[model samples]
Target: LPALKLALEYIVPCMNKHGICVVDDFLGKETGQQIGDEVRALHDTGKFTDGQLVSQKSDSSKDIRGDKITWIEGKEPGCETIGLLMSSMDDLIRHCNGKLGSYKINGRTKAMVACYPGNGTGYVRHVDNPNGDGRCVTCIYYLNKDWDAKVSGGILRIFPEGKAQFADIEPKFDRLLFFWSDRRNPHEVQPAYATRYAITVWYFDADERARAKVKYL
Candidate 1:
């Protein structure tokens, strides 16, 4: 609770002024280790598949976004860690909506646990929801313990709108990063020298959700 409040305190103001925020030790060490272990176990069981790109089909897409992923709806068998992560996102949505008064976020997308294998794999620059499919906030939790950006090389690089410089973020354990999902934040994943893991969920706005449904359905 205190941690959540503290995280929000740092994230909300930075989010409003800078359009991004990074909070370390977001869920604490114990929960972070547990989550890392769970995802590793899932990966070992071959539950993950090659990640796909938006509107792109075929296996060749792996060259652009090289990662294996498994989706979590926050309610899966023996997946309490993912569920806990989802609850945190829910709380984040609630808090942000209340604090900002203009977000109107009513739901989030399924969480994705992705592992970028240690073969120099990385995603290219792109926005999460460029077409405005309702995604408002991009919430990512890194699970790589003792990750050194210099060695691991799986840093998340973001080119924030209106900023001349880019930010490079390491995938440290228990670290959470939040930013806009649309054109305001264009980001990419640098090639990794070691296996890197992260879980991400996108919070969606209510009005945009309605518009998306009508346009797509």
Candidate 2:
């Protein structure tokens, strides 16, 4: 849990009330660089895989998203390559749930690594988690090095519901963002000048039947 605890504690309140929190320097410089390297390597490896984007926990690639993604199932899938980072993040998610207590969520979460290719690639604005699946929260960690907004156009455009102001977060290194998944603040990614990579985790209530109705990932 190393660096995760401090950030999680500080972010809990923001998420509790506002329904969204963005944390900078989520990982230390060294760890951040290391992870960036690992993720780039993983992407370059030509192994693992990416499937069509799924929506509403049921809709297929034909729905709304246009990005490619590969699921990282625990550390069991590719432990040797992604175990260290995945396990650490899993601990963070669990520890965050502990801090959350009964903050209206079930406390369980799942994660996957997504790759958005270049050539003006992006996803249309949409609410990721629907109520039928009991999805309560979502966490996204950016894994790009030297992210300059001028050079990079892949900003995570989050439009909070019932608000006049919104935020466009650049996929900067080690930046972590968490938000409620109640179909409120829908978001989108701007077309990128280069490949954009991120790790996204969705949290849900423990209602098994609620989970069963949606896509497992």
Candidate 3:
């Protein structure tokens, strides 16, 4: 675990220069298991609301698989847990300084919890918050129990270097994926044979300027 901590220590500089960093085996078993349980519990009772489907173009070859993405407003009961997780992330960012840090959460800004079901194939290649200034950091928590490489196909593919450089992580429960929000970071999830679940936390630094620019439905 020391190596994992050290890896996190160095993620910011690498991300700043290269726009991406991969920290393998970052979380220990205990934490990972706990997170997995929490995510599953949330998803079991969570509701999925209709959200905009992300696409490339009118006749684009690739589009996100038709899956439900439920957006939880800050006032929702689950918002507290989401906020706590974000706060913990903030602590990590502060520990690393400006390298792998997140923008501060303010009243002008808002947060949401996104739940992706494993009912069918999910997500095509796409970006989170493509046109919104209200998105700064995107954190996804995978919730799967006894995840199998064969059945669980919800791997997150991140195109950090436009669409060229790709980094992928299988949908393993308790694993958390954190990345900066930008046009360069295009991502998607493959279909899952079994049920796949995850919690998405998005943060934005909402100042007067940002609020004026942000348009959300």
Which prediction has the highest lDDT against the true structure?
1
Q: Write the per-residue lDDT of candidate 1 for residues 98-167, one digit (tens) a residue.
A: 5542678888888989999777778889999899798888999999988898887999999999889999
**lDDT by residue for model 2 (19-108), tens:** 778878766678777766666776788633653443434545344434666666555433333455556555665656645535444544
Candidate 3 lDDT over 100-136, as tens digits, reads 4444544222334444455456677887767656665
TM-score of each: 0.90, 0.77, 0.67
Q: What is each predicted model's overall lDDT from 0 to 1? A: 0.83, 0.69, 0.57
Any runs in candidate 3 off by more than 4 Å, and if so which?
1-8, 22-28, 50-66, 70-83, 100-113, 162-165, 205-217
Looking at candidate 1, the ten consecutive residues that score lowest on lDDT are 53-62
Lowest summed lDDT across 10 adjacent residues in model 3 is found at 105-114
Q: All candidates: CA RMSD in angstroms?
A: 3.3, 5.6, 6.1
| Candidate 2, superposed: residue stretches over 4 Å from native | 1-9, 48-66, 74-81, 98-110, 208-217
lDDT of 2 at 157: 88
